[PDB]
Amino acid sequence: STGSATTTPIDSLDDAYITPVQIGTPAQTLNLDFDTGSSDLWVFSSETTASEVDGQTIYTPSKSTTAKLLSGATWSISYGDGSSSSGDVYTDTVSVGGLTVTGQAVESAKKVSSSFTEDSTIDGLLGLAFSTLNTVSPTQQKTFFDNAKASLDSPVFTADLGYHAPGTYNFGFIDTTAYTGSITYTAVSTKQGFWEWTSTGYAVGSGTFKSTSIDGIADTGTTLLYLPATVVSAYWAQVSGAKSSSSVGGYVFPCSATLPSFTFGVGSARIVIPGDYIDFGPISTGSSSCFGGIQSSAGIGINIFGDVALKAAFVVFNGATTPTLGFASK
Ligand SMILES: CCN(CCC(=O)O)C(=O)c1cccs1
Ligand code: NA
Incomplete structure (x- = not known):
């Protein structure tokens, strides 16, 4: 299998790039920041403190027929810029660019720091570093790439970011x-x-x-x-x-x-x-x-x-x- 998705700058400075991601059944499309420096797939959700949501699209697990609570699992992450988020965990079907993973850990935010709230264009992160950094406790979870790897034509993904323009993330081929x-x-x-x-x-x-x-x-x-x-x-x-x-x-x-x-x-x-x-x-x-x-x-x-x-x-x-x-x- 392969996947191919377009990634788009969030603003005129290329401060970050967002890529649409389908979560759940029927699909809920959220625009995630693909991050090769972290290993959590976390989203704004129906569980996020209401005062911490300002324009983001949220994931609502109760509306997905394939969502299951990952009972007892929590997560909490702090990034290099001082931002943070935490919450609980669902498993659900996640698709990127036509490539589908079943049973992906989808980390649902209960709390996000101010820098996330203030960025209406980013609905969460999709981590692409090694799964050894994933913050879910007590059972560490795999990244989308680690879960997709065995199904891919080649165990690779590629980043082709644009300068003031869209680019592409491909999975499974060069x-x-x-x-x-x-x-x-x-x-x-x-x-x-x-x-x-x-x-x-x-x-x-x-x-x-x-x-x-x-x-x-x-x-x-x-x-x-x-x-x-x-x-x-x-x-x-x-x-x-x-x-x-x-x-x-x-x-x-x-x-x-x-x-x-x-x-x-x-x-x-x-x-x-x-x-x-x-x-x-x-x-x-x-x-x-x-x-x-x-x-x-x-x-x-x-x-x-x-x-x-x-x-x-x-x-x-x-x-x-x-x-x-x-x-x-x-
Ligand atoms: C012999 C140089 N070479 C390949 C460089 C190229 O891709 O042409 C290497 O030493 C590699 C080491 C680890 C990954 S590749
Ligand atoms: Na700045």
Whole structure:
């Protein structure tokens, strides 16, 4: 089997991407944020505290003939941005892009933090990291990908995110029309439960490539590219008037600037992030200071190849017995 779904930016900055997901019978379609940095499939629901729901579409298990309470199971998650959610668990049928899993754990939110409530466009998350990170207790649950894997034509999914445009998540096959050149594969460590890999270095603009190992994770649920402070300082030093502001919480730059590209290494391959991808616009409406898309990881504890990096590439998440990541230009 295979599945193929379109993923759409939630706003004009590509702050996140939403993908429609069918849950239950008859189908309830919710727009979920597919997150390769977490392992819970959780939704706004009929159980969510009413004051914490503001425009989201909710899952109502009582209206699904295939929903069953997973008796005694609870969940609670905290993300790297400080947001959180918790609740109870149902099993139900879940379909993405024509690919169906029966018996998927659907984590129903009773509580969500303010950042979720305030984002009316995101109805929940679909985690695509390793199932070792799933927060359901006392019985940990599998991701949608881990439940689909054995049925797929090939044990893979691919992320093809757009710059200010829709893109695609495919399950079970590699669309050889979706990228240019060849795919370069690289090793993954699952020791922390993430798609963790090692980049072979970087370049700023037309500058020379610096060969240096940069461990990090491939995380579709993180907007920006978070790298070591040395690398980030070398990038922003090429932009007149750029600086780190602790008042704004990251690198800012004059909106009048033209930004240089940023290249990262995948083995001998190179992925080039155009300068425009690194512009996240005004720090507040009407401001002439703009927020940078490459930020320091020094206050995180991990480097994160978020959407700014991933949407420059066709990315293969290979869940074979020995997992790998693949990257290609497009
Ligand atoms: C021999 C290089 N090479 C493949 C790179 C390519 O895909 O061309 C590798 O070492 C791999 C190790 C782990 C996954 S692939
Ligand atoms: Na922000």
